[PDB]
């Protein structure tokens, strides 16, 4: 019943990635966690939804983020891996958009900081972020200089 798998590559995310909602462009109080398991669904069908997309152009399974764990390459030359957010459609009628652009469907779009998502011709729309780190700024400071 369930119309996505999870390829063998999943992985929860170390990033704290959170996903800011707007209805009729204005903010909720809080963004929704997208960072504790390794696949988001979103769609109108609150029985099966993570994230319940409630406007009636949406469809029961709309759209998935799936994180997968894939290469990296270190500043160095030398290989790592990260784990980071892909978005699919999941041949929604009305579709999905990032950054005002539809998607094809059944295909995995890497999703960055600041993307703008809207499923369908919903009044809602979403905003992918992660916080800053004094951590990731002192790591990032130090391989500029």
């Known amino acids: 019943t369930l119309l996505?798998?999870?390829p063998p590559e999943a992985r929860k995310p170390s990033e704290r990635w959170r996903?800011?909602?707007?209805?009729?462009g204005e903010p909720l109080n809080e963004p929704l966690c997208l960072h504790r398991q390794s696949c988001?669904?979103?769609?109108?069908?609150?029985?099966?939804a993570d994230i319940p997309t409630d406007h009636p152009s949406?469809?029961?399974q709309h759209a998935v983020i799936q994180y997968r764990e894939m290469e990296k390459e270190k500043p160095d030359g030398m290989m790592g891996k990260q784990v980071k957010p892909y978005i699919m459609d999941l041949g929604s009628t009305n579709k999905?958009?990032?950054n005002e652009s539809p998607i094809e469907p059944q295909r995995?779009?890497?999703l960055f900081e600041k993307d703008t998502i809207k499923f369908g011709n919903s009044s809602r729309e979403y905003v992918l972020?992660?916080?800053?780190s004094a951590e990731?700024?002192?790591?990032?400071?130090?391989h500029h200089h």
């Open 4 to 6: 996505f798998n999870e």
């Open 96 to 98: 999905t958009y990032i």
């Open 40 to 48: 988001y669904l979103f769609g109108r069908e609150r029985r099966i």
């Open 58 to 60: 949406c469809s029961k």
């Open 129 to 132: 972020l992660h916080e800053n």
């Open 19 to 24: 996903l800011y909602v707007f209805k009729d």
């Open 136 to 142: 990731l700024e002192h790591h990032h400071h130090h």
């Open 108 to 110: 995995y779009y890497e």
